[PDB]
Every structure is written in structure tokens, then in C-alpha cells.
Design a binder for these strands. Structure first.
Lengths: 48, 113, 200, 122, 180, 131
RNA sequence: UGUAAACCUCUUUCAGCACAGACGAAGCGCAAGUGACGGUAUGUGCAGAAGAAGGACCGGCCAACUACGUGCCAGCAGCCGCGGUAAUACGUAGGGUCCGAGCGUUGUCCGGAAUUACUGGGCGUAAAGAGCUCGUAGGUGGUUUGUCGCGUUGUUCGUGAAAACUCA
RNA sequence: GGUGAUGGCCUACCAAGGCGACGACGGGUAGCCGGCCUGAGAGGGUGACCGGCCACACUGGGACUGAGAUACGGCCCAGACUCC
């Protein structure tokens, strides 16, 4: 019954090469764009 | 196709069917979609019951029932209704509701006294 | 399987009349055998077993049939002793006995086993047939020529008939009004011991 | 133990000792006796006890114990095996069922005939 | 009238230069079948003597029990030397469900429908002592409402009170059929 | 360090009840206050109040002993502890002593005993058992 | 032994013999017939107790005792363990008990086993605290205002195939 | 380019990147499930019947056909065994 925080990587997509590292993002799933590219960006969200 | 079938159930001597809308490429005691009725011929007045509305739905979407079920539908009037031939001519015979246990007991009492 | 051996034997084994009029029991109510007098290591298991052996040899049930009845009584929503005892007195041989057209439990078992009765329009050659409320056990045509049965219909002023039953006719037509309960029945040993046994 | 320990490692359980391994989950097996002889039990119980040394069809060579008081068994006889602990002996687990494929219901045993394989007097 | 028990007999032996000066023990439980419960560990060279000691010592050391008709109020953990017991109420018609020791205790006490379990210290001595500790940990809802000032309605649920009323009805019935 | 102030509260009351002390002293918090008010309602203790200290506030509790020195609180225990955060649906609420004793739930409607929470229909985090 | 028995009555189920003899098919056909199970199921009668009961166990857990034969033997056994002429424990008789068309045995699994303990366990001596510190990942986190409402909680919708299970 | 279709499914080129002590890469076993058995209940073992899915069809590969192929009772090849 204990709460478990867990980790999970994801591999996603931007058409225009915006986002740097150390950020917070919105996301949405899309039809697969490669092997292991499944999610896309919606809003590069909270700056760093 | 998407036909109307009967599935066999029960035990080895007396059957007690159900009425099914399922694909034709399935098996007899197989998966279903929407059971609608049933049929107990081992009884003499031979029970029949159908949800006529949903039956007419599956007849609308293009089902294609088999001979026996088609006969039952002609009886109950669902086929006659789907085709508007004269109209839903009700041919169904209902079982005789047999006497009530309480009335039997009380009548035997009053007969003895 | 109808047990056949002596009833006197077991009525002496546990030192109680299960038929009542047992003159050989009156003579030798103590147990039988070469060591019938000998002394006892007492225990609770002994009494708990003794209980059900008394019951099932009063009635005729075997252990497996009995255990099925017990599971049913515990499955029901009442409480186990009352439920079981009612379920168990519901049997047909016991019914006809307590109505009195049978002189003995064996005789009732036999008469049903040969199909002499007729329940609401179906032949019944079955002894463990239960009877719910509002059921009319008439007798068939040719129960006449049984001579002690004629004695029954004539002078069955023997052991009393209970309240939830009744007889109303010349062919001795039987009638049930309710299913009994424990305070109504008042038959041998109470059965918390038995419930505890199968609670083991 | 804490719950983080439990989630990180777990409750690894025991594994109990498989009894009667040669039979391979089978109740019996079939056997042929390479030897036939007798052997003495431990120091408290002073007697002389019967023994075989069987080649099973599960391909494991094992002793066996021989109930009753007679035995129709020499080497190469084909018998059948069942399992049973015998406290009197170090390394024995298996018994023999009497009345199967070579062995006979030892004689005059009128009580408990089912266990030894002898018939009823009519 | 009293109900009495004998639920343990071991054969003890002090040892001395001649040899073994044996002796006998006993554990005896007494109960009116209504709530009084007494316990005694009697011993002697003589088994009747030890039994009689246990009898009289149980009749000394009674203890009243918070009953409801035929069943306890609440479940409870009772600890003794190592005797653990998890008593718990039943629903009526269930039976006196326990082993040997606790069965003796509760059947003598008057219980008819109760659960139980031994979880440590299989010895009858400590088992009985733990059961007794549990019965002491029990509390009447009346005394609970007393100690915390509130009334029985806010202190208890409704089903227990149903049991109270129905058992008082059965009891008044029994007594008014007896005398009146 | 400190991690479980509610366990501090409860254990302190338990220790003081065993030592038969009269009044207790803590620092103060909204949650502790609501707990105390619920206990004062349910009947376990006589009274609480808020005095103060050098840097912050402080609670003071006034216990409840029998006239013959009968302790009013028998037992006491925290349930939903850090680590094992125990949550409760209305369908599966805890029953203490058949309902005599008291659970202490933390809900959208605030702290509530189990009965009040059930009558509202609500459920949520559990915090303690009392008897 | 044992009301067990003959004994005089009675009932005749189930099997047995003779006769009749189905529904299962508001169906299929536009022909005239249409049941593999099936001449069975099931009734009708017929003569009559006539054709019909074994298996395991008995020192204790574990309700069930004597005698006899053997007396470190043969042998038994799930554990405690029993046999050196007097055994209720071995094999046979009588007897009794438990079950009953089954009865015992073996094999495997769960249980009891709070004996991997989340509910439901411990670490001074019973087996168990690393030789002691530092600190990464991780875990956990004081008081208080506001905000998000992810966890959480309440309600309703969809779904959770049927059969299984449970209630009538 | 290809597919009924998205896709390194494939291809040329370009950058070198990805995975992992929350156990990858390796090893051993096993068909999954509704359910079944047990148990107070959590939970433990199980996957015979009945039903839904998946893989296979002497062993290993391959494709045509056609709306739809693991193509049992279809084809080609390769091998083991058998037969005229």
C-alpha cells in the first residue's frame, strides 16, 4: 500500500529544435514517428 | 456475415437454447454479441421470448437468420413487422399458469371441512 | 444405503431408546458385548460424535448426506442448529411417521421406497424428498390392502401428531402448514455440539 | 524490517524438501531387484530386517523394504514400489506393494488383506 | 451448583539423594456458566488433593466478565508470559470456538458463541493466564460512557444495543416463566 | 530528529497517562488543536488551551482521571504513519471495538470521527485509533 | 453372540418375464412422409424374499478389549515407540468401533504453519546489530499564508463477455 | 523505396547516439486468461473439463493465390525416416 515514486524515460519530438535541458514540458502522444519516438511537445513550459 | 443463430445448452437430453446475434464464422457454443431470446422445446407449449426492439435493430443492420429462428420470428410477428407483410400477427401461445399452491391447500382444507 | 442391522444394538450402544417401545432395551439398557460394562476415558470429541451418530441412526442418513445438509444449514442465513434440524426433519419418512401412518422409521422408509404415496399428482418412490409449505400428500389407490396400515387409519391414537401437520380424510390425506422450528419440535439432543464438530 | 526494505528486496520464501524424489511425481514406479537380502536396524531395536536394492525405470538405484513375513523374491524379479518412511533405518524411504507383478499375498493373513495382497476365503 | 474442570496433569519430580520424590499437579477452572470464572493451580502427591486445591482456589479467585447475552463485546489481545490470544465475538449460533484450555475457560464462564486463537506459548498455564488478561482488558460500554462522560448512544453503535434489548427480553421471559 | 509530531503528541499523552500526570505541554499546531477539540468532544480529556513560549505558541492539555484514579484512556495508537500512508474508503472504514472506540479521519470536511464521516458519506486519510 | 435367528404374517422398489409405448419436430418438405438415441425412457401387470455387503482400525493424538500363539524372535509403525513365555501395541480368533457400494495405501497442492509475519514476527544471552566513521543514488522531513488539485476522497457515465461464484 | 497502413520495415547519406543496479545484455523454466483448489482473509498453488486469445502442423526455409494464410488433410526446395 505504500506510495512508490518511480522513473520512466520518454523519447519525443520537436520539428524546430527549441528545447534545452533542465526544463518542464507539456506533452501529448502522437502516431509513431520512429522506433521509440512516440510523444510530441505541446508547450515548452517552465523555463530554466 | 452476421447471422442469428441458436446455441445449444443444458444437459444431454433436454436442450434449452438461446438466441444469438453472432458472426457466421464462429462455433456453436461460441462467443456472442447480444443475446435476445430463448426457446425451451422440451416443454409442450414450448417457451419463446424475444426483445423485439433489439431484434428489429439487428434485422435493420442486415442480419440473415436461419430457418428455425425465422419460423419463431414469423410466429412472434417480428419478421412480419420488419417486412410489413400484413403486420405483427401475434401467433404466440403462452404457457398455462398452473394453479397456486396456497389455493390448492386451502381448497383441500375446505373440502375436508 | 439402507442400514439393516439391529436398532436395539445402537440404542444400547448409547443407552437410549430411538424406537421407544424396546423391551430388550428395558432388559439390557447398558451397552452390549464382552466389555459393555467397562469404564471410560471421557472427552469432548466423544460426545460430539455420539450426538450425530444418535441423530443419523434415528433417521437413516449417511455421513456424506448429513454433511451436505450441514453445509446447507450453515449456508442459510438463520443459525445452524435450527436451520439444520428443520432441514433434517423435513424428510418424508419422518413426516409420515410423525403423522402416524407408519409404525416405525424403517416402515416409513420402506413404504416410500416402494412408492405407495402420491405427492400433488406425481408418484414418489423417493424417501429423501423434502416437503415445503403448502404441499398435499395424498395416498394412491391401493394402500388399502396393507393390513397394519388399515390398523393405522383405524386406531392410530398412538404417539401424538404435531401442530404444523394435520390429517383430514378417510384415505388419511396429509397437510403441511409451516416448516417447524426447534422449540416446536422438541426431539432428542440439541446440536451446538454437532455444529462445533463440523466447525472443527 | 521496514517497508522500503521490503519493496527494495522482498520476502523470499523457503523451499521445502521434495519427498520421494526418485518417483518423479509418480505414486508408484516399476522396479527390478538387483539384490535381495536383509539388514539390521539401529542399536535400540534389535532385529533383522528385509531389504532389496532396486533398479527403477526412473533410472535410479534404490533400496526398499519388504513387509509381511515371506517373500517370493530373488534377484532380477520384477516388482512395484510405493513410498513410506521407516524410522528404524538410515537411508530408506521406499516400500514395496505386495501382490503386483511378482509378489504374492503372504498366507493366512486374514486381517488387513488389502495392504498385503491376499484374497478372501469364500 | 458449579462447573469444574481438569485440563492438565503432569507428573513432576523434585530430585533428592535417595531418588525422585514425585508429585502431581493440576490446573482447574471453575465457572457458574454466567460470568463468574475462577482459576487454580493445585498440586499434591495426590491427584484428588491437587484437584480439590484447584477447586477451592478457583472459588477464591473469581472474576466477573463483561458479557452480552452469550457473546463478548469486542475483540482483544491478551498477553501473559508468552500466551497470546486473539478473542473476538461471534454471531449467535456459532459455537465456542477454541482449543482445549480456552474452551474450558469460556464454556465454564457461560460463553456460547465466540472465537479465539493461540499464537504462542502452547502451554495451558500461560494460555489460561493470557485469556484471563484479555477478559480483564474487556470493558463494559456502560463503564466506558462513565469514564468519558458521554451517553451510551454516542458511545456505542446500534447493533450491540439490539443485542442488549433482545437478550433482556429473553431473560425476562425465562425468569417470568420460571417463577411467575 | 523529529519527523512524526502526531506520534509525539500521542505518545506523550500515553506516557503522561501512565505516569498519572495532570497537565501536558507541547508546541502548537492547527492539526494538534483540531485533534484536541475532537478528543474533548468525544470525552477522553477535560480541556486544552494555548499558552505561549519564547519563539512560538504552546499547547497545554488537561487530562481526565477517574474519581478513584481510573484512567479514562485505555489504549491509543497511530495507524497511518509516514511510509505506510493508510487511506480509507467509506465502504471499508475501520471499526474499533465494534465501534466503541474511535478512529480519527482527515477528510475534505476536516477531521471527523468515523461515524460523522460515514453519515456524510465521506472518507479519506486515517490518523489514529483510540480507546 | 442377540430380537440377531428359525418362526407366522406384510410389502413388494431395484433388477427379472408379458402387453402398451412417448415428448424431444408451431419444426423440414410441398410432398404423404419425416427419430440415430429407441422399441428404449416410462406406465400397465405378473410369481415370490425371492438375486443381492463388504473394507480399515482398537496404548495414546484417535470413539473403539479380551483370550490365544510367539516372547530380542518373527514382525508392526504417521510421531511417541512396542516384542528376551504370562504383549489390550506383533499374527489368529471372538467382540466392538468408523465408513458403507465403497474401503484403506501411495504421490502432489493448500491448510494447521503468526514456520518469509502487509493484515501477522524478531536481532543483550535463545541463529541474528556489519569493526567504526564519510557520503552518491534512494528513502523520510519542523511552524505558518496563499495557490495547482497529481496522489487522495465523494458522486454519476462507459466497461468489467457468457459460463463459473452468491442470493431467490 | 515499400506496405492496407504509421514506422530503419528497407535503403544512400549525414550527426553519434542509445540502454542500465527502478537489473540491460546473458541464463533456466513455462503457453496466457476467465476461472479451479485451499484458506477466516489477505494471500499461496494451479491452467485437466467448459469458453476466449497466442504459437505449431515430419524438421527448416519460401512464396503464389485470393478480400483474408501459421495455408493440418495446398505448392517449390532442402534434410531424416518410410514405401513402389
Amino acid at each position: 500500500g505504500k506510495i512508490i515514486r518511480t522513473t520512466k524515460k520518454v523519447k519525443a519530438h520537436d520539428e524546430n529544435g527549441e528545447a534545452g535541458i533542465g526544463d518542464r514540458v507539456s506533452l501529448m502522444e502522437t502516431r509513431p514517428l520512429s522506433a521509440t519516438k512516440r510523444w510530441r511537445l505541446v508547450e515548452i513550459l517552465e523555463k530554466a | 456475415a452476421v447471422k442469428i443463430k441458436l446455441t445449444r445448452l443444458g444437459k444431454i437430453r433436454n436442450p434449452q437454447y438461446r438466441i444469438i446475434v453472432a458472426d457466421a464464422r464462429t462455433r456453436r457454443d461460441g462467443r456472442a454479441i447480444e443475446v435476445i431470446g430463448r426457446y425451451h422445446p422440451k416443454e409442450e407449449p414450448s417457451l419463446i421470448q424475444i426483445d423485439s426492439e433489439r431484434a428489429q435493430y439487428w434485422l435493420g443492420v442486415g442480419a440473415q437468420p436461419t430457418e428455425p429462428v425465422l419460423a419463431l420470428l414469423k410466429i412472434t410477428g417480428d419478421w412480419q413487422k420488419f417486412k410489413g407483410l400484413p403486420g405483427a400477427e401475434g401467433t404466440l401461445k403462452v404457457k398455462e399458469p398452473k394453479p397456486s399452491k396456497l389455493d390448492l391447500f386451502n381448497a383441500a382444507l375446505a373440502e375436508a371441512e | 444405503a439402507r442400514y439393516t442391522g439391529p436398532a436395539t444394538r445402537k440404542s444400547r450402544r448409547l443407552g437410549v431408546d430411538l424406537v421407544g417401545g424396546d423391551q430388550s432395551f428395558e432388559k439390557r439398557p447398558y451397552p452390549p458385548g464382552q466389555h459393555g460394562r467397562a469404564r471410560i476415558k471421557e472427552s469432548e470429541y466423544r460426545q460430539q460424535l455420539q450426538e450425530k451418530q444418535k441423530a443419523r441412526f434415528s433417521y437413516g442418513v449417511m455421513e456424506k448426506q448429513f454433511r451436505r445438509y450441514y453445509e446447507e444449514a450453515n449456508r442459510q442465513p438463520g443459525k445452524t442448529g435450527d436451520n439444520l434440524l428443520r432441514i433434517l426433519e423435513s424428510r418424508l419418512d419422518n413426516v409420515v411417521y410423525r403423522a402416524g401412518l407408519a409404525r416405525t422409521r424403517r416402515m416409513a422408509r420402506q413404504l416410500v421406497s416402494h412408492g405407495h404415496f402420491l405427492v400433488n399428482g406425481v408418484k414418489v418412490d423417493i424417501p429423501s424428498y423434502r416437503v415445503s409449505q403448502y404441499d398435499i400428500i395424498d395416498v394412491k389407490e391401493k394402500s388399502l390392502n396393507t393390513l397394519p396400515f388399515q390398523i393405522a387409519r383405524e386406531t392410530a391414537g398412538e404417539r401424538p401428531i404435531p401442530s404444523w401437520l394435520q390429517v383430514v380424510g378417510e384415505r388419511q390425506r396429509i397437510l403441511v402448514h409451516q416448516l417447524p422450528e426447534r422449540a416446536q419440535i422438541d426431539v432428542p439432543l440439541t446440536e451446538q455440539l454437532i455444529v462445533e464438530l463440523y466447525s472443527k | 524490517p521496514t517497508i522500503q526494505q521490503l519493496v527494495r528486496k522482498g520476502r523470499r520464501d523457503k523451499i521445502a524438501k521434495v519427498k520421494t524424489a526418485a518417483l518423479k511425481g509418480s505414486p508408484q514406479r516399476r522396479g527390478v531387484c538387483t539384490r535381495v537380502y536383509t539388514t539390521t536396524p539401529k542399536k535400540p531395536n534389535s532385529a533383522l530386517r528385509k531389504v532389496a536394492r532396486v533398479k527403477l525405470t526412473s533410472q535410479v538405484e534404490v533400496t526398499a523394504y519388504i513387509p509381511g513375513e515371506g517373500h517370493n523374491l530373488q534377484e532380477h524379479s520384477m516388482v512395484l514400489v510405493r513410498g513410506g518412511r521407516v524410522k528404524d533405518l538410515p537411508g530408506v524411504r521406499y516400500k514395496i506393494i505386495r501382490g503386483s507383478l511378482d509378489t504374492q499375498g503372504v498366507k493366512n493373513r486374514k486381517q488387513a488383506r488389502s495392504r498385503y495382497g491376499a484374497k478372501k476365503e469364500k | 451448583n458449579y462447573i469444574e474442570r481438569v485440563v492438565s496433569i503432569n507428573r513432576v519430580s523434585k530430585v533428592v539423594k535417595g531418588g525422585r520424590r514425585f508429585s502431581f499437579t493440576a490446573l482447574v477452572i471453575v465457572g457458574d456458566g454466567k460470568g463468574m470464572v475462577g482459576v487454580g493451580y493445585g498440586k499434591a502427591k495426590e491427584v484428588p488433593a491437587a484437584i480439590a486445591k484447584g477447586v477451592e482456589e478457583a472459588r477464591k479467585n473469581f472474576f466477573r466478565v463483561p458479557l452480552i447475552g452469550s457473546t463478548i463485546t469486542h475483540p482483544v489481545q491478551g498477553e501473559a508470559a508468552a500466551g497470546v490470544v486473539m478473542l473476538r465475538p461471534a454471531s449467535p449460533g456459532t459455537g465456542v470456538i477454541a482449543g482445549g484450555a480456552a474452551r474450558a475457560v469460556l464454556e465454564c464462564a457461560g460463553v456460547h458463541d465466540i472465537l479465539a486463537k493461540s499464537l504462542g506459548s502452547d502451554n495451558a498455564i500461560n494460555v489460561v493466564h493470557a485469556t484471563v488478561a484479555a477478559l480483564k482488558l474487556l470493558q463494559r460500554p456502560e463503564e466506558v460512557a462513565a469514564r468519558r462522560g458521554l451517553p451510551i448512544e454516542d458511545v456505542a453503535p446500534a447493533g450491540m444495543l439490539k443485542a442488549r434489548r433482545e437478550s433482556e427480553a429473553l431473560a425476562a421471559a425465562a425468569a417470568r416463566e420460571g417463577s411467575a | 530528529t523529529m519527523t512524526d509530531p502526531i506520534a509525539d503528541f500521542l505518545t506523550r499523552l500515553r506516557n503522561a497517562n501512565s505516569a498519572y500526570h495532570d497537565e501536558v505541554t507541547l508546541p502548537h499546531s492547527k492539526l494538534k488543536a483540531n485533534i484536541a477539540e475532537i478528543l474533548k468532544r468525544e470525552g477522553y480529556i477535560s480541556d486544552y488551551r494555548t499558552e505561549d513560549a519564547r519563539v512560538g505558541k504552546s499547547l497545554v492539555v488537561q487530562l481526565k482521571y477517574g474519581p478513584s484514579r481510573e484512567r479514562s484512556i485505555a489504549g491509543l495508537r497511530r495507524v497511518s504513519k509516514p511510509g505506510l500512508r493508510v487511506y480509507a474508503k467509506s465502504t471499508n472504514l475501520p471499526r474499533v471495538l465494534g465501534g466503541l472506540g474511535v478512529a480519527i479521519i482527515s477528510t475534505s470536511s476536516g477531521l471527523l470521527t468515523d461515524r460523522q464521516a460515514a453519515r456524510q458519506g465521506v472518507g479519506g486519510e486515517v490518523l489514529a485509533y483510540v480507546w
